[PDB]
């Protein structure tokens, strides 16, 4: 006896822009948001570029006094959230506040703050750790601070499922509404992992592209010369709403959230199975959840992180799940332009999938100069493709073999 | 139309013991697991004691190679998880593995690992960061490594909701089963924040008891001389199972999980509202979820962290929710003995609630020498109280005003 769930608001900070429309313009233009990092000295690091959010002004949202306490991941998460609530036109009242909840997640949350409080502790000692370190750094405080600012009293929580965080946060918030725990959820992800620990940590695991000479050409999903993902920062937030609650208040409806899949590879801590069996199971769970034939999918927003193993695993999974229809649909990686927003990747890509439906256009896979062996699908190489899209699918795969799939369709 | 969920296995590392029965013996004996910390120099810190796990042997569960890369919070979570799966008697097969998932969470996850990789980064630079830093430190890797070790292909995720993490992880895993997403879930929490950042972080926010001269007397919920919570380490894990799946395989059933409630205070980043209005809403949501009259609750395992504001707010909430029945039920804080396991607090306290039902006994609130103004309920001061218990309730409250309540009842 589950209710239908629609998207009535979207908000975003990306390497391509400080909101959704500016980010989406970047996407359709094939623009890279990847550039040498400038906020820290990366001379000793094998990767010196990433997707920074450019020109972020927190004072558009919060007092400088408030924001001083908050790690950038919380600033970015609040900014995207505030945008999405505004965009929904939803009015929070005594009558609906217990029915509006929040699920904004992160991969690691306040790493910059943790790194800085660690410097203070080691160099100076524990009397120099900020009283605001914990409430300013832990992952659930986007959900926390958003609920305090807006008076949201519904379910209040955060997921942390590595690069799957954004996808799961949206899927499980949809489940909250579908099963009557809430009428409205603000859900998505924020990440700011562009510090020594983040760039050094992924560096030490050799996960990152080291194409320092051409940073805009580094993220090249399914291209034979790909050499790992590009670390990027940002936040995506959607207002999810029960269909009748939306219809009743005359809400502008972007799309319907019809399918959510989760699954575990149970294969390896960091590498995906070569045949993408976990991704394949996850996509099939989401399609069954949606009551859809695989042939109804027109657009896939791939995980497509630009790793050797991950990209081909995703091709195999799509070929397994869709058979001959795999050559009819369009699949692209917007990480070709945005790089990899980690715990935020699934939230910004949920928004790009919803906009692909609104505008009937497949975003491009830029830098796809030489598709690898077996990468023979319509990957929307170089340039945006206007086309029919009634159903869009977004994938995220994470450390621990954790998988998420979101299925959106045009709302009647 | 939603399915019933029972507890068929439990696992724990606590300051009181390296498994459930040893921990539960400590609880019923009124024993403190709180002592001066010995694994680090705390001379410059205002708090020098906490609840350590004593004598943990990871090699009972993992190979040296398996354990070396993993933060203690993952070691502790895997140990509790493995105990719970063994304790369930569940056999994982090709036939049931896609129906068995994992939701083990943490407040902050791999803080000790983060501290250690930061020392290397500051002293020597990023070439000295472990390749295993990320997969070895991030919160979702208890769920990840457990699924890889046991071949679990069901829903795979992690919550991070501060001190509410364990309660939410259990509640939402129960929802997964109730709503047919899985037949079995391993759920709970693990925390190891007994490092500089943890003791310094909470110290800087003045949240911790500084009664260094009597560490076993420091955790004193509802006592007039209380001066903040006691930082403690450990893990709790429950095997949650659909009732018919349990009956069908002849599983031993500890208790039924009947109610789960969440709510946001939307009041303050760290302080609860004086009248505990958020807690009150959360407890009422759980009882409504359970289809129970407040008068059916016999035992409450309080949040009861031993903070001035938190303890009295919880009394107010119980008085609001239960009225005259507030004087009939028994409410205790096992943190009087265990200290606060943070993201694990909710998991170990879910287990103590289930055991209060099994043994028909209310655990004591030790150190309750002088109950504060308004603390005039049956708080089970000093000594365990044998009594009728058909329904037990467990609360957790977190930073961000995030609330969780779990309602368990004796299984027919
Ligand atoms: C994502 C991927 N490579 O596809 C993977 O889940 C991952 O490594 C992210 C883990 C967490 C993110 C934040 C980390 C900071 C150090
Ligand atoms: C605890 C509480 N009872 O309010 C609080 O919610 C909390 O634990 C915040 C941080 C969680 C744990 C990890 C942090 C360690 C430094």
């Amino acid at each position: 006896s589950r209710r239908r769930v629609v998207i009535t608001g979207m908000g975003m900070l990306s390497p391509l822009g400080l909101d959704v429309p500016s980010s989406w313009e970047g996407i359709l233009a094939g623009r890279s948001g990847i550039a040498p990092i400038e906020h820290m000295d990366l001379s000793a690091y094998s990767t010196r570029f990433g997707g920074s959010v450019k020109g972020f002004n927190v004072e558009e949202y919060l007092s400088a006094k408030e924001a001083r306490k908050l790690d950038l991941f919380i600033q970015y998460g609040l900014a995207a959230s505030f945008q999405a609530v505004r965009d929904s036109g939803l009015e929070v009242t005594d009558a609906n506040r217990e029915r509006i909840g929040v699920s904004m997640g992160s991969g690691i949350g306040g790493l910059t703050n943790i790194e800085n409080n660690c410097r203070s502790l080691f160099e100076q000692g524990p009397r120099r750790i900020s009283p605001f370190f914990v409430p300013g750094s832990i992952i659930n405080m986007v959900s926390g601070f958003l609920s305090i600012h807006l008076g949201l009293q519904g379910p209040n929580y955060a997921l942390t499922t590595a690069c799957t965080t954004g996808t799961h946060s949206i899927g499980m918030a949809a489940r909250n509404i579908a099963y009557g725990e809430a009428d409205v959820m603000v859900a998505g992800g924020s990440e700011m992992a562009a510090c020594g620990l983040g760039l050094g940590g992924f560096g030490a695991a050799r996960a990152l592209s080291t194409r320092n000479d051409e940073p805009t050409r580094a993220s090249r999903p399914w291209d034979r010369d790909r050499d790992g993902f590009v670390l990027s920062d940002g936040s995506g937030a959607l207002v999810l709403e029960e269909l009748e609650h939306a219809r009743a208040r005359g809400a502008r409806i972007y799309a319907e959230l019809v399918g959510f899949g989760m699954s575990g590879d149970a294969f390896h801590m960091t590498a995906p199975p070569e045949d993408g069996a976990g991704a394949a199971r996850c996509m099939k769970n989401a399609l069954r959840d949606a009551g859809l034939d695989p042939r109804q999918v027109d657009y896939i927003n791939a995980h497509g992180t630009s790793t050797p193993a991950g990209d081909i695993a995703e091709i195999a999974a799509v070929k397994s799940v869709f058979g001959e229809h795999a050559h009819a649909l369009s699949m692209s990686s917007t990480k070709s332009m945005t790089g990899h927003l980690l715990g935020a990747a699934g939230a910004v890509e949920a928004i790009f999938s919803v906009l692909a439906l609104r505008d009937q256009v497949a975003p491009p896979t830029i830098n796809l100069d030489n598709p690898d062996e077996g990468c023979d699908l319509d990957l929307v190489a170089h340039e945006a493709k206007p086309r029919k899209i009634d159903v869009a699918l977004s994938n995220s795969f994470g450390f621990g073999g954790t998988n998420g799939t979101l299925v959106f369709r045009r709302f009647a």
Side-chain angles (χ1 to χ4, degrees), chain A:
Chain A
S1 270
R2 79 188 206 159
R3 311 182 298 162
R4 299 163 62 189
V5 176
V6 294
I7 315 306
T8 57
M10 305 199 285
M12 178 186 299
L13 292 179
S14 85
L16 286 180
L18 295 182
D19 64 18
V20 170
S22 69
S23 296
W24 184 235
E25 264 158 53
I27 293 291
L28 294 194
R31 208 198 333 289
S32 173
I34 309 311
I37 283 167
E38 275 202 302
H39 57 272
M40 67 180 295
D41 185 351
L42 294 180
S43 61
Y45 296 70
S46 55
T47 298
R48 297 180 287 272
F49 60 90
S52 303
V53 176
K54 267 88 67 192
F56 175 56
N57 182 12
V58 72
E59 289 196 299
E60 283 291 330
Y61 303 90
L62 301 163
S63 67
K65 158 211 81 61
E66 165 136 31
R68 276 218 302 283
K69 308 158 186 183
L70 311 184
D71 185 87
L72 289 172
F73 100 94
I74 300 168
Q75 293 182 31
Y76 291 172
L78 289 184
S81 296
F82 283 137
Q83 280 178 36
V85 173
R86 166 175 306 289
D87 190 47
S88 68
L90 182 56
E91 292 171 357
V92 183
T93 71
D94 285 351
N96 67 12
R97 77 170 70 266
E98 289 178 33
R99 301 298 298 169
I100 312 167
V102 196
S103 180
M104 291 290 289
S106 185
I108 198 154
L111 196 58
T112 299
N113 262 358
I114 291 162
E115 213 183 275
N116 293 340
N117 283 265
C118 221
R119 211 169 305 96
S120 300
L121 172 62
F122 292 170
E123 287 204 67
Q124 300 151 10
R127 291 164 177 109
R128 293 309 295 276
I129 300 159
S130 169
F132 298 116
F133 164 55
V134 186
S137 306
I138 63 175
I139 291 164
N140 72 305
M141 294 304 296
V142 179
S143 298
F145 276 106
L146 184 69
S147 90
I148 296 164
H149 280 292
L150 298 185
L152 310 180
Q153 287 184 345
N156 195 291
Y157 67 105
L159 304 199
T160 178
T161 61
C163 292
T164 315
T165 303
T167 299
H168 286 167
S169 303
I170 292 172
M172 292 192 144
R175 294 281 198 254
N176 297 129
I177 299 164
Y179 291 119
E181 292 176 276
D183 300 324
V184 184
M185 290 294 285
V186 187
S190 51
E191 205 91 55
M192 207 287 177
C195 59
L197 281 180
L199 284 146
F202 281 115
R206 312 176 59 78
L208 294 183
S209 179
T210 65
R211 192 178 305 275
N212 296 298
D213 57 318
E214 302 169 302
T216 68
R217 289 172 87 175
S219 194
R220 47 200 313 106
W222 304 295
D223 179 85
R224 81 186 169 217
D225 297 312
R226 65 184 184 285
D227 71 320
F229 74 85
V230 179
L231 197 152
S232 300
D233 323 339
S235 52
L238 289 78
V239 172
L240 283 68
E241 193 168 351
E242 190 272 319
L243 179 55
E244 298 316 321
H245 189 282
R247 278 168 162 171
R249 74 181 183 84
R252 178 260 290 102
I253 290 168
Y254 283 109
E256 193 177 353
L257 183 41
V258 280
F260 177 49
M262 321 174 55
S263 103
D265 286 343
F267 178 62
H268 190 277
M269 57 171 198
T270 66
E274 286 173 24
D275 72 350
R281 285 202 298 284
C282 189
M283 287 192 274
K284 293 154 65 139
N285 288 339
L287 295 172
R288 266 189 269 100
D289 190 46
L292 290 178
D293 197 79
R295 288 174 296 164
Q296 295 185 256
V297 170
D298 295 318
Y299 177 64
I300 300 170
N301 187 276
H303 193 46
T305 61
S306 203
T307 66
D311 294 7
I312 50 183
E314 200 164 7
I315 295 289
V318 172
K319 279 175 168 178
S320 176
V321 175
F322 293 98
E324 286 323 304
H325 183 64
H327 297 283
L329 57 68
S330 289
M331 181 158 59
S332 66
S333 177
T334 50
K335 299 193 180 59
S336 64
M337 288 164 281
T338 64
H340 191 168
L341 276 84
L342 300 176
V348 298
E349 283 152 34
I351 294 167
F352 297 155
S353 293
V354 165
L355 290 168
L357 288 165
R358 192 199 60 196
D359 294 349
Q360 294 295 284
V361 56
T365 305
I366 74 169
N367 296 319
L368 185 37
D369 305 326
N370 303 294
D372 208 333
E373 206 266 308
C375 292
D376 66 325
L377 304 181
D378 175 18
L379 294 178
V380 201
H382 305 305
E383 285 158 56
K385 182 194 287 208
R387 65 153 289 158
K388 167 249 171 196
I389 306 171
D390 226 82
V391 166
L393 185 148
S394 168
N395 295 327
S396 293
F397 318 125
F399 287 180
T402 196
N403 302 299
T405 304
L406 286 168
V407 186
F408 300 93
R409 102 181 291 171
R410 279 205 294 182
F411 174 63

